Amino acid sequence: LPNITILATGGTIAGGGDSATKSNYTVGKVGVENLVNAVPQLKDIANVKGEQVVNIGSQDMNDNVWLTLAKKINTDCDKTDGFVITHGTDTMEETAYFLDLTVKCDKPVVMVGAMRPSTSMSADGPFNLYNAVVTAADKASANRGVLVVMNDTVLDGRDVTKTNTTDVATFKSVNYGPLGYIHNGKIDYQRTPARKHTSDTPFDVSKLNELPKVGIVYNYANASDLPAKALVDAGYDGIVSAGVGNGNLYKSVFDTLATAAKTGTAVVRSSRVPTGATTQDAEVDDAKYGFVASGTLNPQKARVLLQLALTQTKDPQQIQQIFNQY
Amino acid sequence: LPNITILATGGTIAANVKGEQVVNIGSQDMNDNVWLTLAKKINTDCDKTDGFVITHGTDTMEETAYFLDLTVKCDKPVVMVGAMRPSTSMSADGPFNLYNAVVTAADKASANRGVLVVMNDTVLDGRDVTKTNTTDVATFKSVNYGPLGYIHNGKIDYQRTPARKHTSDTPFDVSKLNELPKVGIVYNYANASDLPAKALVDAGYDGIVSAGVGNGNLYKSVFDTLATAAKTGTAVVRSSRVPTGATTQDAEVDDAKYGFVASGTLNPQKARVLLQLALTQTKDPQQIQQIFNQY
Amino acid sequence: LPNITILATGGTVEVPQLKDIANVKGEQVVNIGSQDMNDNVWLTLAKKINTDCDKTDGFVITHGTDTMEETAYFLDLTVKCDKPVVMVGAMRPSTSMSADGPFNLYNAVVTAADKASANRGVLVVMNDTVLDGRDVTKTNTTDVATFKSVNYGPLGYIHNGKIDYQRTPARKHTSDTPFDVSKLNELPKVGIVYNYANASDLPAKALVDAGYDGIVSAGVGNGNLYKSVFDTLATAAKTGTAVVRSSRVPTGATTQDAEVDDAKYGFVASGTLNPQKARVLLQLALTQTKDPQQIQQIFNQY
Amino acid sequence: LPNITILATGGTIAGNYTGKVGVENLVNAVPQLKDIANVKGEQVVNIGSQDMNDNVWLTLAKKINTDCDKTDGFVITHGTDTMEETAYFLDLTVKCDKPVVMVGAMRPSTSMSADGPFNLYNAVVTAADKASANRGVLVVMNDTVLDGRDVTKTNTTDVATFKSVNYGPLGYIHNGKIDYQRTPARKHTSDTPFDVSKLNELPKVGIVYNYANASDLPAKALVDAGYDGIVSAGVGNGNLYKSVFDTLATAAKTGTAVVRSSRVPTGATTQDFVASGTLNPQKARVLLQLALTQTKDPQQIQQIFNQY
Numbered sequence A: 001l002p003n004i005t006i007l008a009t010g011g012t013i014a015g016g017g018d019s020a021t022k023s024n025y026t027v028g029k030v031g032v033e034n035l036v037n038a039v040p041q042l043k044d045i046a047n048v049k050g051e052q053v054v055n056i057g058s059q060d061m062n063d064n065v066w067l068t069l070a071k072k073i074n075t076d077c078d079k080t081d082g083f084v085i086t087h088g089t090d091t092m093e094e095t096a097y098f099l100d101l102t103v104k105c106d107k108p109v110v111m112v113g114a115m116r117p118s119t120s121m122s123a124d125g126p127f128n129l130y131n132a133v134v135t136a137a138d139k140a141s142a143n144r145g146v147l148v149v150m151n152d153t154v155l156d157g158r159d160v161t162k163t164n165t166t167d168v169a170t171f172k173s174v175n176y177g178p179l180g181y182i183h184n185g186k187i188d189y190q191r192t193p194a195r196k197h198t199s200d201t202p203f204d205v206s207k208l209n210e211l212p213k214v215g216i217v218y219n220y221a222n223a224s225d226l227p228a229k230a231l232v233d234a235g236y237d238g239i240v241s242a243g244v245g246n247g248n249l250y251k252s253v254f255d256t257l258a259t260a261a262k263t264g265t266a267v268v269r270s271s272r273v274p275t276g277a278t279t280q281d282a283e284v285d286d287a288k289y290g291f292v293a294s295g296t297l298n299p300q301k302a303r304v305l306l307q308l309a310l311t312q313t314k315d316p317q318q319i320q321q322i323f324n325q326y
Numbered sequence B: 001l002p003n004i005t006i007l008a009t010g011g012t013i014a015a016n017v018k019g020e021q022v023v024n025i026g027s028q029d030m031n032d033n034v035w036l037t038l039a040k041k042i043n044t045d046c047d048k049t050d051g052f053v054i055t056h057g058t059d060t061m062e063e064t065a066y067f068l069d070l071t072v073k074c075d076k077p078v079v080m081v082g083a084m085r086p087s088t089s090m091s092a093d094g095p096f097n098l099y100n101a102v103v104t105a106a107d108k109a110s111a112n113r114g115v116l117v118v119m120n121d122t123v124l125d126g127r128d129v130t131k132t133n134t135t136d137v138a139t140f141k142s143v144n145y146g147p148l149g150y151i152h153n154g155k156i157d158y159q160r161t162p163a164r165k166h167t168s169d170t171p172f173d174v175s176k177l178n179e180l181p182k183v184g185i186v187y188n189y190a191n192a193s194d195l196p197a198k199a200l201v202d203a204g205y206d207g208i209v210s211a212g213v214g215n216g217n218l219y220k221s222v223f224d225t226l227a228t229a230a231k232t233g234t235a236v237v238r239s240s241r242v243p244t245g246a247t248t249q250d251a252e253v254d255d256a257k258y259g260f261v262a263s264g265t266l267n268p269q270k271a272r273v274l275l276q277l278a279l280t281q282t283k284d285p286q287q288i289q290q291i292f293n294q295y
Numbered sequence C: 001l002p003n004i005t006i007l008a009t010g011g012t013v014e015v016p017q018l019k020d021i022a023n024v025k026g027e028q029v030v031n032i033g034s035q036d037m038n039d040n041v042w043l044t045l046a047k048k049i050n051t052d053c054d055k056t057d058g059f060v061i062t063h064g065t066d067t068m069e070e071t072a073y074f075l076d077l078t079v080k081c082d083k084p085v086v087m088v089g090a091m092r093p094s095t096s097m098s099a100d101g102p103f104n105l106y107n108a109v110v111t112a113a114d115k116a117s118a119n120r121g122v123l124v125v126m127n128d129t130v131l132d133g134r135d136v137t138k139t140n141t142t143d144v145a146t147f148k149s150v151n152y153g154p155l156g157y158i159h160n161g162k163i164d165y166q167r168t169p170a171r172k173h174t175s176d177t178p179f180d181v182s183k184l185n186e187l188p189k190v191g192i193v194y195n196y197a198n199a200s201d202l203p204a205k206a207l208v209d210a211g212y213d214g215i216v217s218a219g220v221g222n223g224n225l226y227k228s229v230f231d232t233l234a235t236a237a238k239t240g241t242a243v244v245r246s247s248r249v250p251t252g253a254t255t256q257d258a259e260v261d262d263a264k265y266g267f268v269a270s271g272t273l274n275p276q277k278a279r280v281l282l283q284l285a286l287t288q289t290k291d292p293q294q295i296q297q298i299f300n301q302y
Numbered sequence D: 001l002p003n004i005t006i007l008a009t010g011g012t013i014a015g016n017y018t019g020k021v022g023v024e025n026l027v028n029a030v031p032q033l034k035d036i037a038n039v040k041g042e043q044v045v046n047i048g049s050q051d052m053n054d055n056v057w058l059t060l061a062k063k064i065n066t067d068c069d070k071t072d073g074f075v076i077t078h079g080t081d082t083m084e085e086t087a088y089f090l091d092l093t094v095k096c097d098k099p100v101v102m103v104g105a106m107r108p109s110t111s112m113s114a115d116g117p118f119n120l121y122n123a124v125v126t127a128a129d130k131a132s133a134n135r136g137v138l139v140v141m142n143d144t145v146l147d148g149r150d151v152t153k154t155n156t157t158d159v160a161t162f163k164s165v166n167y168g169p170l171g172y173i174h175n176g177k178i179d180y181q182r183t184p185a186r187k188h189t190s191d192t193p194f195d196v197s198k199l200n201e202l203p204k205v206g207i208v209y210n211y212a213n214a215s216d217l218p219a220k221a222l223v224d225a226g227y228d229g230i231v232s233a234g235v236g237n238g239n240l241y242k243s244v245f246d247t248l249a250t251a252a253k254t255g256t257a258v259v260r261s262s263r264v265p266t267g268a269t270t271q272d273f274v275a276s277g278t279l280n281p282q283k284a285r286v287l288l289q290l291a292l293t294q295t296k297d298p299q300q301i302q303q304i305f306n307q308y
């Protein structure tokens, strides 16, 4: 059997309530050891060994935890045969994509969480973790980048997103679909991501204790320019617009961001719309203003890529060029 | 034949049918004054026609549709439509959508269902319909409860109607209003700044909607700031950037301690519409929370 | 607490938390896997619910998942009880890791005990969602979230034991239907034939040779038929056999006024009813009429 | 400009309404095609794809394999009803790795907002994109490139009906440009063991449906015809009504190859009789038919269903 290291960070998989019944619960309490215990079967498939990195609800996830995860994995890659990262569901699409862009290990790295608390009746965490270890222990999972395993499905870290607020089936790769499905502990992979991931990115976070400041602004009718101005007034390195439709902006937000782009702030057009690309060649002429189109990357994921891109280059043409490749 | 009025407002998209251009703006520039003008326009001319089709941009159609769904006091069908392909394109989708929207607006069965959106052969309710894809002609979906009806060969097979209140069942009248209360929206994500929330609070907004993570959750910075703002009188509604499902009560956030309002299935931009309207009546979060339980 | 009866039939009789929301009574009606469901269990279930309706406040039926969407629609059309009737099952074994059965059964009782669930027809409760008996269908082969109402959506979502209902089925059900199974020991014989390239007409013709009352076609696209199958079903309709055009395609209506001249042959267009669901309405249709027009009206109204 | 050959079989793209417009009428109605490809057009048949059959399939395989060297890519206009079957058949039998794109239309050409013209335009864009080669046989519909194996018709009327419901599309078309981000892993085209080049027949494979109370007469009818194979459209995870299973067990015992598939639109029929995997019944038929051209062993047929 392979050695699988479980790096715990918290989440509802690590949450507990007051009842098998009430929905009231608190995230990120139970330790990694109690999680492993709940799934004795793992020892049929892998020698697991858990490490508690943090124990938070991932609505409080941040750069420090990310850099800690990437470095730990990069450092211990030849000490283990693969990784499972227990994580909360809310920002798991952010961390999966961050690790997808920064981990230089091509051993399987697999994230997992739970939408029902461990104390819940019919809790989903035990079986999810079991299938995460299955995925991590499977040689065929290697070299497909960072993975998210939820609801019997292997999803790539770039395109996986949280689709529903409460459904156990919430995670879906809404643009290009999953990579493979898990049935009775076996995966039939029929796909792999074509965009560059893990060991093929230029991003090196070994010597990095902080990432460039990137904020997100939302677009809607009558939208105030005050959030955009605040991120400018503070001098963020980059700003991601959660636009309307195909990455469009409300007029006052556009004005603030068009000025900021001239004065060096990286500006990325993404979209609040849950699927489909923010393309070039539509209603916004990006080259004219020095904006970047985020492609299929939703706003929280475009932020991850823009942050990493700002450690390599200011140049809008180069940043766009990164968004066309990662 | 019935009389149907087409009120044009903009968009890629550009019975006895009568046509009128009220405004012409890309819907990404939609704003309070157009909404006020548009609701006033429809309430004034309701008696003069049998139904309205409103041609509109797709980017914020789900926002206008819900605003009208809450402010129109006319029970006659009001049917919004747009188009994802330019009208000069091969296989332009606008012509058939407008046709189907007039059919919907003329059908006696469409009445009393509130403001509707007709796209890609489907009749969708103003409350649940949202834009799910940035470019697909099939983008508009009612992602939580599904469509009201399907249209084939000019006939409608209606099998659903909204239980939440709309149109003439709402108390919201904007007839003598020239402004709406200021409501902004802030995004949550890992390591998020509270600067957006701080700026709107410092500007003394009437309300802030939180595009939360998962089941309406907030980054600790943003959540400290909004809890502080909620106690200082700023209305705060927890919504979710997650495209489907409700922000509920009784999950991780104890709303009653903080004075927060759970948005339910209303996404952030739709939650903003209802908050705005609720702030013309009450400002107590507990009275606002029932508002969000009925509309 | 409401009095709630649990009728077991099998699936994947005597979950402690059930006692906090209803006084639960059980009896084992039958004991089959639902891939083997049949007319006799449907008649039994319907007569059972109609006789005991006044002895209880509502019903929960445990059922296998494979044909739950068929029994739900049949009960939807034959149960004359307006009180809540809720079907539930599980996609993972009860001994499974993260078994879904316990929380599904809990939420079903929550639904059967909610007075707001009455007058909405027969209901399917799976994966925190309340689904109408007509539109609900199994969409994935293994997913716990398999059951969806794929044309018109759910009636409500269940959270923290509370149901926020926002919809109710417009089509007729329960006490608004003419179908009465109380007098019948058997149902008209209706079979289903599949369409695909180079499709054989042997399966349809075998049904005609056995003298079936009706035949449902799972057609291609908008109810279309391979040439030999349509020759075969044209011949059946000529001899008086009812023919309903449905579709193998998983969502959308089989419409009239399309590629097939239904009134010429006497065919019926199934609307959004998928093949196995159209068989239900046609069997019940045939207890009331054999006229193709009357049957089209029924597929339009229920 | 690339040389693109269009092979017309009919369908609503060429067809309440009645395949009757010619290939050259479809090509001539999209003059924009002249600015992306030199279009060459041939009429294989002109039928509704509800009437698609083995003969047309054998002819299309043979035409593409024979003329592969003479053009740069192929677009096959086709009815939408069985386009998902023809595409998988070609996916498994054409030995040409140049782009092969199938396309149809859900609205008649005279309909307003008719989807045909832009679909065809996008089909030719895709067939001219050299990046489309080595991806297998493709279906291009509603701005989306879909692998021939997973694509299926999901709605009876929707212009957006075609979807790769288990693993998703290969690419999206925006302003005449494809961003490919996936390719199929299961083997296809020149990587398959099947040669139909000298066949005028295919083995006989039928499909029987499962439901409550289900009659065994359709399966028996196919056992009585001596079919080479039967695909079961089972309930849930490939399960069978009792009486149908009894007859298929009889068929299997006497040499008929039996594949379990599912009437359920998404997800695999698992092992744990041949298990169909994510292949729906009409796709299972295609592969089973081809498998019976080289073996009758159930066990060797399963290996085939695990590779293609």
Ligand SMILES: N[C@@H](CC(=O)O)C(=O)O
Residues within 6 Å of the ligand: A010, A011, A012, A013, A015, A027, A028, A056, A057, A058, A059, A087, A088, A089, A090, A091, A092, A114, A115, B214, B217, B252
């Ligand atoms: N706090 C949320 C989100 C998270 O932990 O990521 C949960 O319970 O899952």
Ligand SMILES: N[C@@H](CC(=O)O)C(=O)O
Residues within 6 Å of the ligand: A245, A248, A283, B010, B011, B012, B013, B025, B026, B027, B028, B056, B057, B058, B059, B060, B082, B083, B084
């Ligand atoms: N983006 C423009 C045009 C369109 O998408 O319809 C608008 O919303 O008005």
Ligand SMILES: N[C@@H](CC(=O)O)C(=O)O
Residues within 6 Å of the ligand: C010, C011, C012, C032, C033, C034, C035, C063, C064, C065, C066, C067, C089, C090, C091, D236
């Ligand atoms: N075995 C599955 C399917 C069935 O029994 O029909 C269940 O019990 O739910």
Ligand SMILES: N[C@@H](CC(=O)O)C(=O)O
Residues within 6 Å of the ligand: C221, C224, C259, D010, D011, D012, D013, D047, D048, D049, D050, D078, D079, D080, D081, D082, D104, D105, D106, D107
């Ligand atoms: N009956 C037609 C339907 C279509 O083309 O849309 C066909 O498949 O040929």
